[PDB]
Design a protein around this ligand. Sequence first.
Ligand SMILES: [Cu+2]
Ligand SMILES: [Cu+2]
Ligand SMILES: [Cu+2]
Length: 503
Amino acid sequence: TLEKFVDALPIPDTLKPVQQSKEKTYYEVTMEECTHQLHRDLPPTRLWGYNGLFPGPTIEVKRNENVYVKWMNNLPSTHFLPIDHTIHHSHEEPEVKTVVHLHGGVTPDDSDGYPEAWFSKDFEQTGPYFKREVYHYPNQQRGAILWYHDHAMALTRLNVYAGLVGAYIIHDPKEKRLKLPSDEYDVPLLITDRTINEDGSLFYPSAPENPSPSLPNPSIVPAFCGETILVNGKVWPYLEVEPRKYRFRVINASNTRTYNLSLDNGGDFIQIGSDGGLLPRSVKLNSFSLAPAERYDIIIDFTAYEGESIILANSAGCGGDVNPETDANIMQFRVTKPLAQKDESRKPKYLASYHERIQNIRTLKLAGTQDEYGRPVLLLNNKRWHDPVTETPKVGTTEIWSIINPTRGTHPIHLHLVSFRVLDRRPFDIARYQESGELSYTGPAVPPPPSEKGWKDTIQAHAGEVLRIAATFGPYSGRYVWHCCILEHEDYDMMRPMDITDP
Ligand SMILES: [Cu+2]
Ligand SMILES: [Cu+2]
Ligand SMILES: [Cu+2]
């Protein structure tokens, strides 16, 4: 095992445009086999990286900036992580397929990275919903932390684990007057748990434990928990900071793992933002939950802690209780950087402003059948991906989605295109719902905590609760998706199409 806090936190560079005008910013990003050392004491690791980087370069845009990214694939024809060929059914398609989803993007459908819009190297082969090489991101939306990652059908868990993640920030100039910490004092933190072999190579399980020899090989697993935690591509790093306010864009880019984060001296975060942008009012927190694909925009105020080492800790376990010596640790702040200037940043209470009729109320169930080989298959509302679309909201209208979770565990559910408000959660009789299909509540409705009073696009639906959210669908119409963000679930098969229609 590996010494904690011996490597500096990398901060990914900001991508430079290939061409740029008042009217159009044009970027190129090529997926490439690359080599990077993840820890002082590990041989370098072979990974897949956007422009040869892990994590991918940070992309920074203004609200309404007219952006194009040509996402290209220049990867090997053959994968280096275990492909389970039995999970989706078929001329022969390439083994390695990729497509980039801008998670949180208010995006035209053919630029949203639909799982069947995939492509292989140089776009030689393309999936049946592919339309275009150069994706278009108009960024007509709230300033926020987005992130980009692969979304290829049956492969998402693999392609992401391989290293295909990156941050995308939307800056709204109108927010500049809040004087939030910025520039060097505004730092994204992409958290990814990994398991790494002694020779430096990524370990990803090629079967669950106790593989009955009937079971395919490789076989998909229903969950992955990495032995090590990385932030921005380094195992358990440290970051030297100035004793002053910092903003952090915290992103869970892990396959399965949920984090429950705190500072080991009992100190407080200030949440200024959720997936969908600034909260209306800032919230003071001692801890916070962070499931796959969630994003918390926070301030940590180091002013009074000059000289100190503060650990960003985690108490959520993955497949067992946290281990204090390993996954209980995320990174270490060292407040030893001299101030480069006066800290003019603020941490205001007042951040943003907070009339619509309900067109429809979709009731949706989270549940799993079981396959030929005994393995669990997780399904949204009893459907497989390939079944005729059923979630078909009307452009311009508002729906309430009530998501019922009678499973053993939490699912972070994500809708593309939209961000949405959270209404409440409410517990119910699980046995009763499974026996009869009948829903009896065992307690009142609970509103969201303040963290979740703003806009969200990825939301934890806890076991034995009904969660209700509300979304207005637009401004674009077309074919999108919704799904669980635990990638091991997403790929088998907790993802469905979502058509937003127009007369
Ligand atoms: Cu998304
Ligand atoms: Cu799930
Ligand atoms: Cu998605």
